[PDB]
Each structure stands twice: as structure tokens, then as C-alpha cells.
Amino acid sequence: DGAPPIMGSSVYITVELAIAVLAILGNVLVCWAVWLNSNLQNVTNYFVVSLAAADIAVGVLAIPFAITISTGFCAACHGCLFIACFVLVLTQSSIFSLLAIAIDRYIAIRIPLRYNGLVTGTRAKGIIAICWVLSFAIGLTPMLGWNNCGQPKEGKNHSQGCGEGQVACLFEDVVPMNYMVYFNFFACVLVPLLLMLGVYLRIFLAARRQLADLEDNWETLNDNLKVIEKADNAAQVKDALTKMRAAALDAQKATPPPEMKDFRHGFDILVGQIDDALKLANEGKVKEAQAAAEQLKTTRNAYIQKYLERARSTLQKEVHAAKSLAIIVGLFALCWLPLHIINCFTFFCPDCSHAPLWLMYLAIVLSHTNSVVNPFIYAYRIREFRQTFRKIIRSHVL
Ligand SMILES: CC(C)CCC[C@@H](C)[C@H]1CC[C@H]2[C@@H]3CC=C4C[C@@H](O)CC[C@]4(C)[C@H]3CC[C@]12C
Ligand SMILES: CC(C)CCC[C@@H](C)[C@H]1CC[C@H]2[C@@H]3CC=C4C[C@@H](O)CC[C@]4(C)[C@H]3CC[C@]12C
Ligand SMILES: CC(C)CCC[C@@H](C)[C@H]1CC[C@H]2[C@@H]3CC=C4C[C@@H](O)CC[C@]4(C)[C@H]3CC[C@]12C
Ligand SMILES: Nc1nc(NCCc2ccc(O)cc2)nc2nc(-c3ccco3)nn12
Ligand SMILES: CCCCCCCC/C=C\CCCCCCCC(=O)O
Ligand code: NA
């Protein structure tokens, strides 16, 4: 005999209900902000809303299901399976939304000119609907036959006094552990997580490479410039002008990120001034070419230096934003890996004693807290969400 089980159950139920309240309120706020602000109405945030909708359903459905199944109540085994497995649908939907966000940010930084013609809202909405259908198929797969309903625990069934066709509804009695470990964890969770890690790695490498190319063109522009002011040879000045023209056409085609009329004007003055200094160089007028090339220092100061700064800050904002979204993925893995790792010990080590009950429910509670944290990450790291949060709160609550 030990402590009455209702005492520890009261702690678990209260904590679960506290999580459900916060998960609903915070993610309702996220959906409200995107509905309200057109600046937040882009393809990237449609998956953020699909992700927020999954977390609302954790508080509205998954946590009540979790409280129910903790009692071990008698139920038809396939009704028990739906109660046990529905949270796997919502978690799989979250993985699809996170994977789509990473790929979306990869397309945006790799092919900026082709982004809006390739990634549209209509295609995004279709991708979201397909991912929700696949999430139900993956998460509810044990209902298709991969379950332990055919091997019921008759000791627990008779102890709790279940009827005919009923089982004591406990998670590890109806859901097989080889599904949870091989199918759910390895194939459906671990593999997509590693792919997300690789995509974001490709995002950060692409940004670092584009910034280096921008810096390379810039110092190449100034290096040949100081070289022209030195060489007493006309061909030596022509050499610098040619390696100066390539870096000009390079940086021009490098960063367009019509309305950018200055970018064409500022670069047409530059390339046109270089071509002028070239015709002087070919005709042997060395000091006339050196004097013409000194005009570049004005076009550079009045146009080219302004495009480099605007291009660098655009890439730094993309890095900061992809860093914000990668935190979402890291907090997801942090909240869900303990449960998966416990299942591995249960499955792979039959000589190990089972993890204690209090640790099992701490891992369950921890996985539910993930449906609370994302709105905080948005509020702290994305200014457009933070500002829209204030407007909603100050005006409609206060
Ligand atoms: C629109 C929303 C609120 C619908 C909610 C659907 C939920 C509450 C319904 C749909 C299917 C239902 C389950 C289907 C069958 C069984 C087996 C029975 O032996 C115990 C009840 C149980 C486990 C039901 C519990 C309630 C249930 C899970
Ligand atoms: C936070 C994330 C990244 C890491 C989480 C580490 C957790 C999940 C690990 C660290 C130590 C592990 C425990 C150490 C040893 C045992 C005893 C064994 O008989 C059952 C499993 C059990 C109880 C392990 C369960 C999982 C465990 C608690
Ligand atoms: C990036 C990381 C977190 C991926 C997940 C690592 C997992 C798959 C690894 C880390 C620690 C490992 C466990 C550590 C020790 C044991 C005890 C052994 O008797 C059975 C296997 C088992 C239970 C391992 C299973 C696999 C395991 C859980
Ligand atoms: N193993 C497990 N158990 C439970 N609940 C049952 C906890 C339990 C375990 C042993 C026992 O004797 C009584 C209760 N929920 C669970 N959820 C998950 C899970 C969801 C996603 C990944 O792992 N695993 N999981
Ligand atoms: C627009 C977002 C919402 C998209 C529609 C969501 C509806 C998906 C519902 C059911 C999909 C069917 C897959 C269910 C698997 C069968 C298992 C079973 O029920 O026995
Ligand atoms: Na989620």
C-alpha cells in the first residue's frame, strides 16, 4: 500500500489544465494577429497559423484526451486507440509545418527573383491541406491494424471490471512500442528533424557566401581603383579597369534585392564611366584615363555604397529571421525527445526496469508545454508580431 493515487493525479490534472489554458490563449493571439495585420499575411505565416492551430487543438482536445487515458478507464479498444493516438496527428502536423517553413526560407534566400512566382498562397494552402491528411494517416496508423487490441491484458481487464470487447485504456497496452520507436520516432520525427537541421545549415551557408561575394566585389572595386592611381602604364590601367568592370557587372546582377530605378541609374553611371576610361586606355591616354577613373569615386560614394549597405542589411535580416524560426525547431525537439528516448529504453532494454510513473508524466507534461512557447518566441524575436500583439492587447483587452 502507498499514497492514494488521487493525490498525484490531482497534481497532474491541474498542471495539464494550466497548460491547456495558456496554449489556447497564446495561439489564439497568433491567429488573431495574422488575420489583423496584412504585413503578417504571407506564405511563411500560413504555416505559422497551421502550426498555431495544431497547438490550439492540443489544449482543446489532446490534453483532455491525455487526462482521460491516465485513468485507465474501460473502453472499446479502437475507441481507446483514437484517444491514445490523436496527439500523434497534431505532432506530425507540427513537423510538416516546421519543415515547410524551413524550405520556404531556403527558397527565399536561394532564388529570390523566382520566389513569388513559385511559392504562392494557393499552392501553400494546398500543401497545408495535403499535410493535414497525411498527418491523420500517419498518426492513426495503429487503428489500421498495427495495435495490441488482439493481445489484451486480461489481468488488468478483469481487475478494472471491463465488459466484453473492452480493454483498460492504457497507452503502453494498446499502442505497440515498435510502431512508436521505428515508425513514429525514427521515420516520422527523427528523419524530418535532421532534414530541417540540414536545410537551415544550407540557409546560413548561402547567406555567409552571398555576404562574402558582396564584400569581395566591393574591395575589388577599391583595389583596382587605388591601382589606377599608381601605374604609369596605359595597359596596366586598362588591366585594372577590366577586372573592375567584371566586379561591377557582377555586383549589379548579384543583388536586385519596376521600382529600383536608382540601382540601374547608379550602376549605369558606373559601368558607363568605366567604359569611358577604357576607350582612353586603349588609345594610350594614360593620364586622361587616370583622371576619368577618379570620377568613379563619386558614383561609388553616391550610389554603389548605398546598394551594398541595403543588400547587406537585407541578408542580415534574413539570417536573424531564420535564426528565430530555428529556435522554434530546437524547442520542439527539446520538449519531445525525452518521451521518445524513454520509449527507446522501454523497447530496447528489456533488462532495464521501466521508467517510474512520475517521470513518464513529467515527459508527457513537458511535451504539452511546447504548445505554449511559440507565441513567446514570436513576441520576443519578430517585431511585426510584437507590435501587433500590443495593438490587440491594449485595444481589445485594456
Ligand atoms: C467536435 C469535437 C468536440 C468532437 C469530439 C469527439 C470525441 C469527444 C469523441 C469522438 C469519438 C469518441 C470515442 C469513440 C468511442 C469510444 C469507445 C467507448 O468505449 C468509450 C468512449 C469512446 C472513447 C469515445 C469517447 C469520445 C470520443 C473520442
Ligand atoms: C532534454 C533532452 C535533450 C535529454 C533528456 C534526457 C532524459 C530523457 C534521459 C536522461 C537519463 C535517462 C534515464 C536514465 C536511466 C534510466 C533507467 C532505466 O531503467 C529506464 C530509463 C531511464 C529512466 C532513463 C530515461 C531517459 C532519461 C531520463
Ligand atoms: C540526436 C539524438 C538525440 C538522437 C536520439 C538518440 C537516441 C536514439 C539514442 C541516445 C541514447 C541511446 C540509448 C542509450 C542506451 C541504451 C541502453 C541499451 O541497453 C538499449 C539501447 C539504449 C536505450 C539506447 C537507445 C538509443 C538511444 C536512446
Ligand atoms: N510511453 C508512453 N506512455 C504514455 N502514457 C502511459 C504512461 C504509463 C506508462 C506505464 C504505466 O504502467 C502506466 C502509464 N504516453 C505516451 N506518449 C508517448 C509518446 C507520444 C509521442 C512520442 O511518445 N509515449 N507514451
Ligand atoms: C484545411 C485543413 C483541414 C484539412 C481537412 C482535414 C480532414 C482530415 C480528416 C480525415 C482524413 C482521413 C484520414 C483518416 C485515416 C483513417 C483512419 C480511420 O479513421 O480509421
Ligand atoms: Na505543436
Side-chain angles (χ1 to χ4, degrees), residues 2-12 14-109 111-113 115-150 152-163 165-201 203-208 210-225 227-231 233-235 237-252 254-258 262-263 266-278 280-296 298-305 307-309 311 313-316 318-390 392-396 398:
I6 194 186
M7 301 186 62
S9 298
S10 296
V11 175
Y12 166 71
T14 301
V15 172
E16 288 274 53
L17 294 181
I19 294 172
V21 171
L22 300 167
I24 293 166
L25 282 176
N27 286 285
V28 157
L29 182 61
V30 171
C31 298
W32 197 346
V34 174
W35 171 279
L36 226 63
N37 191 344
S38 290
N39 293 323
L40 296 171
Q41 297 184 3
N42 47 69
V43 163
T44 307
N45 287 334
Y46 295 169
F47 301 104
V48 169
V49 170
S50 174
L51 183 58
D55 286 331
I56 293 166
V58 163
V60 175
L61 283 179
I63 288 175
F65 289 174
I67 292 162
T68 302
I69 200 171
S70 71
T71 67
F73 74 115
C74 296
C77 190
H78 289 253
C80 180
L81 271 174
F82 183 83
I83 290 307
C85 292
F86 184 71
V87 67
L88 304 181
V89 172
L90 305 178
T91 310
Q92 201 62 40
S93 180
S94 302
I95 278 147
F96 287 153
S97 294
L98 290 173
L99 182 58
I101 292 176
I103 294 171
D104 176 85
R105 293 300 84 201
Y106 176 75
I107 299 174
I109 204 177
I111 44 168
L113 287 317
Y115 176 83
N116 292 282
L118 169 59
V119 193
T120 63
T122 289
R123 299 173 187 173
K125 298 177 202 306
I127 289 177
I128 295 180
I130 294 172
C131 288
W132 274 98
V133 168
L134 294 175
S135 296
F136 275 91
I138 293 175
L140 301 176
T141 285
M143 299 205 294
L144 300 186
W146 196 355
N147 58 68
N148 291 328
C149 291
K153 302 278 189 59
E154 275 311 318
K156 299 181 185 176
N157 165 84
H158 288 144
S159 306
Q160 303 219 354
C162 298
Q166 289 185 326
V167 300
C169 189
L170 294 170
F171 186 94
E172 289 189 9
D173 290 342
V174 296
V175 189
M177 203 59 66
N178 50 25
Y179 166 88
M180 288 303 306
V181 171
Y182 288 144
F183 196 83
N184 194 263
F185 180 39
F186 287 169
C188 294
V189 173
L190 200 42
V191 168
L193 282 178
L194 297 176
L195 293 178
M196 293 181 227
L197 174 58
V199 171
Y200 277 112
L201 268 175
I203 292 186
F204 294 129
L205 285 166
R208 180 167 67 82
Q210 293 176 15
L211 292 164
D213 288 20
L214 251 39
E215 172 60 35
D216 268 22
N217 284 338
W218 172 239
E219 62 185 16
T220 293
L221 211 286
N222 304 341
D223 281 14
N224 294 17
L225 199 38
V227 161
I228 292 173
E229 313 177 13
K230 162 197 178 62
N233 174 27
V237 167
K238 177 185 178 180
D239 165 89
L241 289 163
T242 53
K243 298 169 170 55
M244 199 171 183
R245 186 183 203 269
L249 302 182
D250 216 87
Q252 186 176 15
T255 332
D262 301 87
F263 190 84
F267 267 88
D268 277 33
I269 300 178
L270 184 65
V271 180
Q273 278 166 319
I274 296 179
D275 284 341
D276 287 350
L278 271 178
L280 284 179
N282 276 260
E283 299 171 2
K285 297 90 156 294
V286 42
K287 286 192 178 60
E288 206 166 45
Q290 295 176 355
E294 283 285 354
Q295 306 174 10
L296 303 167
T298 276
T299 305
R300 179 199 64 185
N301 289 6
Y303 304 93
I304 273 68
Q305 189 178 6
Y307 308 140
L308 170 102
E309 293 185 318
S313 60
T314 295
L315 289 171
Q316 291 168 342
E318 276 178 291
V319 172
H320 173 85
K323 202 122 59 181
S324 300
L325 303 165
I327 294 172
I328 304 279
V329 180
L331 289 179
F332 180 93
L334 186 72
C335 291
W336 279 103
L337 275 174
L339 210 36
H340 290 291
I341 293 173
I342 290 172
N343 286 342
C344 288
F345 279 95
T346 303
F347 180 63
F348 283 132
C349 185
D351 291 313
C352 301
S353 63
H354 199 288
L357 204 74
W358 65 265
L359 183 57
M360 296 301 309
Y361 285 103
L362 185 64
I364 294 172
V365 163
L366 176 65
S367 76
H368 294 168
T369 65
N370 178 254
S371 295
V372 176
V373 304
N374 290 345
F376 287 87
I377 307 300
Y378 303 145
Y380 275 97
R381 295 198 52 93
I382 307 180
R383 178 181 249 94
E384 194 68 29
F385 271 109
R386 175 188 319 121
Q387 296 174 341
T388 312
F389 285 0
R390 298 184 173 274
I392 299 175
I393 292 160
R394 290 175 177 172
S395 304
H396 300 81
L398 302 169

